[PDB]
Amino acid sequence: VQGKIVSYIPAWVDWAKDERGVDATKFTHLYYAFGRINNGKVVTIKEDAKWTEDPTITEADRIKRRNNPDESNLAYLTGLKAKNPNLKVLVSIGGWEAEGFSDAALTPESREVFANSALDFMNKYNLDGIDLDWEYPVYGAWGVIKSRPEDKANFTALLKLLREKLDAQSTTTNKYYELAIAAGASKTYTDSVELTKITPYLDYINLMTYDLHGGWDPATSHHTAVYSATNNQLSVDSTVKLYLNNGVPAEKLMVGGAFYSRVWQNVENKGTGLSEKAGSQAGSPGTIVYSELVNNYINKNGYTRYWDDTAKAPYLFNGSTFISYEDTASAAYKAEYIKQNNLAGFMYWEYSQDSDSHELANTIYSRLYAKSGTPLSVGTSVYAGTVTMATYTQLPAGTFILPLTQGTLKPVISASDVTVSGIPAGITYTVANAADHRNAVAVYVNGGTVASNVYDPIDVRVVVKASAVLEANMTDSAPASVTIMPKFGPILLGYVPGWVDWTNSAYKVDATKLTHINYAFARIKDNKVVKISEDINWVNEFPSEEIREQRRNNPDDANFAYLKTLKQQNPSLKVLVSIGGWAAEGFSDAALTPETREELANSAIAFMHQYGFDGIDLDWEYPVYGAFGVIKSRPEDKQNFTALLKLFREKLDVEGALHGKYYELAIASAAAPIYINSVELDKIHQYLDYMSVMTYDYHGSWESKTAHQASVYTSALSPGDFSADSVLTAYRKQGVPASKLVIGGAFYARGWVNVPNINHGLFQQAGDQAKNPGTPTYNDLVKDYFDKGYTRYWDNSAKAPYLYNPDANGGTFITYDDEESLKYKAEYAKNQGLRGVMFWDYSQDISGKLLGAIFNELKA
Ligand SMILES: CC(=O)N[C@@H]1[C@@H](O)[C@H](O[C@@H]2O[C@H](CO)[C@@H](O)[C@H](O)[C@H]2NC(C)=O)[C@@H](CO)O[C@H]1O
């Protein structure tokens, strides 16, 4: 990590007890806002008179202010060195309207008591440095604070001293300490401080290049723009130029940006509202934070979004309220300026004001640790990914929607900026910006009649061109995958295990809710597909003979007949054979040569015809890496798997053209990045009906830290971590159409014994893992857990349930899929244009609720 990122964080949130925590891997420094001065000395904000007594809400809030948890905050924040080692946490002193800088600084005497107490503060909370935010010396923000002309010098002296105290301490500790200032943007500020004396005492000067204009001005303008587009409009550029002219070296200047807007009301309804006269601001809230703009203002509630292309700043206007803000784009242009002009880094006030998802802080990081002159591509995610055929030929009016993940659409895109591949001919389509979204394309797909019958999903491909976007040197987007579904809708597929005698089980299979069954499994033996009772590895997994017998007399013939009655009873039901699965030997050998591939194909085709199947699922676990030596693997598996699949599909096309029927070919495929490496995902998919992605087994007893085994989304408390969302995005990134992906639900759990009672059990360091529960099924969970000690919590940013019991071996943490999570996996599949939903496995919920909740969302 090269240039710096400073993220001020407010003292007046509970960060320990916040739901989103802090992704401290996206900034370098973290200034804590603020400590204050009291009787000439640095202190916690909860000990500040003037801030504990704000009359805006003096009831429930003043209490919270006097008992403000800074101790907890500081401990939680420096604790984030866990996730980032490099991180620095400084204490920032002052802020807007913070009093007593002029008295504490005034005389050599009082400076001591302040600079001393400032170290006491730094030491006490184990902090990497001090930041003085005096606003402002000499002129006191024109009467907001106490001030006198002698500040000019005293500021200098105070700063010199602090540097002495912080180098003194360094020579014993071996840790260099940092000293910063936030510094005013105006010519007036530079005139009130001794810059060519001050610079050398400091590591960085935080230019506050915001609040450059606001409701105090008679006309609108940008408050935190990059460039000056008119003579009178201040900017990062004007301010940086002002500071270089006074000798301050580029290498120490941090450019500032803002996660909030400056607002004007009663603006003349002329032009765009930019540079228009403005009346009374007596009604005005003054600012609106970035999260609130996202939620209700940007392209919402009659507020049009605009861009000043010379200033490189966004603004909104509705005919009378104007709002000037920092967005994804303006941050891009500011990062670029830092790099263009060799500045120290990007500073921002402040972190809490970012969106739920941290859109700005993440944008800055991404832009600042891009390598220059090596263009970034436009990013896409999906919000609405499916339109569904009414009949075999009638397509209704529908609308796909794609938010940008990287880059920022012009407020009005032209057709040349988006190209749509794979709308079937006959059917007119339009592109545009999606209403009620800040930054998203809309392909409006008009009703129509398609030329021929639509039996299979159609992959629609959307390309977001560089000309669409506002940023500078950017390349076209990877062609994004959305889906026109056939009239029958998503598939819902159960893995049905062959080691249950379903003929005699009181618990039966629900062929009315499933579209698809995968009988698990067939196997490989001497390069032949055979029943599971022939595979010696399996039969002889355990020595004990009363198992081994059950294994040899596995009720395959029965179950195949049983499945035949399901098929007769429900004639659209498709039942397929899964060759392989965990510990299944034979695949690598079988894929080697054009002779060995031919053998297995023919033998698989013949197994399929003999016991009544509608297609094949291949379940190779796993190629090239062989699940880390469970399975003979080879580098050459990669291109072989792909010839195996190409072959199977050709044999199955032969079969189908002989039996007057369509045979399916499918694989199961893992989530791990090594799988995605080890397989030619871009190449194999054209041969498949879909991929049953195993969006589960993310974390187990093989780690000693708790985490979500099957989360539909990546929790906020574990950035980076596995989710269905992350994994299926990763799949599509490789080129796999959405309409050939299937999301996996798991009907069993995992867990860890010896989890400390912290945060309901969640993301904790684990203990000794002997007597770990292994994999209890939901059945097990119903009898022996749910009410029997344990308590069910829910992480809403992940949408994944979890159990903790303090009084059981540590206690224990359980991670699983349930009704609510399976619902969301199913919503995700409809929203994203996925082929369908899948699970493992039918025998693990005899109650039928997990299936019910997939079915109730996916189909009704
Ligand atoms: C580094 C920096 O920008 N410092 C100043 C900030 O304090 C100021 O933010 C304001 O801080 C006050 C505490 O001093 C808060 O009461 C107030 O709510 C907060 N304002 C906002 C919009 O979050 C910022 C922004 O005006 O500018 C500096 O002056």
Author numbering: 557 to 1416
What does the study report here?
Genomic and biochemical analyses of the FPU-7 strain have revealed that the bacterium secretes at least seven chitinases, one of which is a unique high-molecular-mass (150 kDa) chitinase, termed ChiW. This enzyme has three surface-layer homology (SLH) domains (~18 kDa); it is specifically expressed on the surface of the bacterial cell and degrades chitin. Based on comparative sequence analyses, ChiW has two glycoside hydrolase family 18 (GH-18) chitinase catalytic domains (~42 kDa each) and one carbohydrate-binding module family 54 (CBM-54) (~25 kDa), as classified in the Carbohydrate-Active enZYmes (CAZy) database. In this study, we have determined the crystal structure of the bacterial cell-surface enzyme ChiW and demonstrated that this elaborate monomeric enzyme is composed of six distinct structural domains.
The two monomeric proteins exhibit very similar hydrolytic activities for chitin. Besides the core β8/α7-barrel, the ChiW catalytic domain has an additional two subdomains, an (α+β)-insertion domain and insertion domain-2. In the solved structure, the two clefts cross each other at approximately right angles.
